[PDB]
């Protein structure tokens, strides 16, 4: 049950971000954990949808209603899309990185959530946790981190 759901969540994130990275589609996916993110869920469009790679991909297609903003995953659902996330004010964040990176950093400073970013400029995948940014991670590295952090 829970472990299978968590592995399916990881697979869904791996497959969708690989798809988007290849096509350089910007994406922002925040996975809630012990810290509650209900307040940011309430800022987006509610989906309460089953997790799948296909739905994640369709959400972030450019020039669509749901593509701007964050997807937030809570429990075993895609809770919301087009959600707002607080932007980090850190001066350490590279000027090369965009708004999605700053939003992922900002939510990671005030929650224990794991947030994944796909850069629309480079296709690189980045991850934020606990106020730190892990830039342009490999597929294997993404896999290891998600296995460690999302499987309990």
8 is in an annotated binding site: no
Cβ contact 110:101 at 8 Å: no
**4 labelled as ligand-binding?**
no
Technique employed here was: X-ray
> Is 121 a known ligand-binding residue?
yes
User: In whole angstroms, how far apart are CA 17 and each of 29, 39, 67, 88, 149?
Assistant: 9, 25, 14, 23, 17
Domain boundaries, position 14: 1-152
**Strand ranges (E), 13-123:** 27-31, 45-50, 70-74, 77-83, 114-118
Could you give the number of structural domains in the chain?
1
Q: Tell me if 132 is assigned to a ligand binding site.
A: no
Residue 23: HSE in the Cβ half-sphere, 13 Å Cα cutoff:
13
Q: Is 101 known to sit in a ligand binding site?
A: yes
- Distances from the Cα of 60 to the Cα of 55, 68, 109, 152, angstroms: 9, 7, 24, 28
Resolution (A): 1.8
- As to burial, measured by CB atoms within 10 angstroms (0-12 exposed, 13-18 middle, 19+ buried), residue 86 is middle
119 assigned to a ligand binding site: yes
- What CATH number does residue 150 fall under? 3.40.1700.10
Nearest alpha-carbon partner for 69 in 34, 35, 42, 96: 42
The angle subtended at Cα 124 by Cα 67 and Cα 50, nearest 5°, is 45
Is 85 annotated to bind a ligand? Reply is: yes
DSSP string, 117-152: EE-TTT--EEEEETTEEE-S--HHHHHHHHHHHH--
Q: Which residue has the tokens 């922002």?
A: 28
| 16 CB neighbour count, 10 Å cutoff | 26
100 known ligand binder: yes
β-bridge partners, 30: 72, 115
What does DSSP say about strands 27-31 and 70-74: parallel, antiparallel, or unpaired?
parallel
The answer to the question of whether 14 is labelled as a binding residue is: no
Q: Which residues pair with 27 in a beta bridge?
A: 118
Residue 122 φ/ψ, nearest 5 degrees = -115, -15
């Amino acid at each position: 049950r829970i472990e299978r759901e968590q592995h399916h969540l990881i697979e869904s994130i791996e497959k969708s971000t690989q798809y988007m990275a290849k096509r350089r589609i910007g994406a922002l996916i925040s996975v809630a954990r012990d810290t509650g993110m209900d307040d940011y869920i309430e800022t987006g469009i509610p989906l309460n949808a089953k997790i799948s790679s296909q739905l994640l991909i369709n959400i972030f297609i450019p020039n669509t209603p749901l593509h701007d903003g964050a997807v937030i995953i809570k429990g075993n659902e895609i809770a919301s899309a087009a959600s707002y996330l607080p932007l980090s004010d850190s001066p350490f964040l590279s000027k090369e990185l965009g708004t999605r990176h700053r939003a992922a950093l900002g939510i990671s400073e005030v929650t224990d959530s794991i947030t994944i970013v796909v850069s629309e400029e480079t296709g690189g995948i980045s991850l934020t946790k606990g106020g730190e940014l892990f830039r342009d991670v490999s597929e294997e590295e993404l896999h290891k981190i998600l296995l460690k952090e999302l499987v309990t």
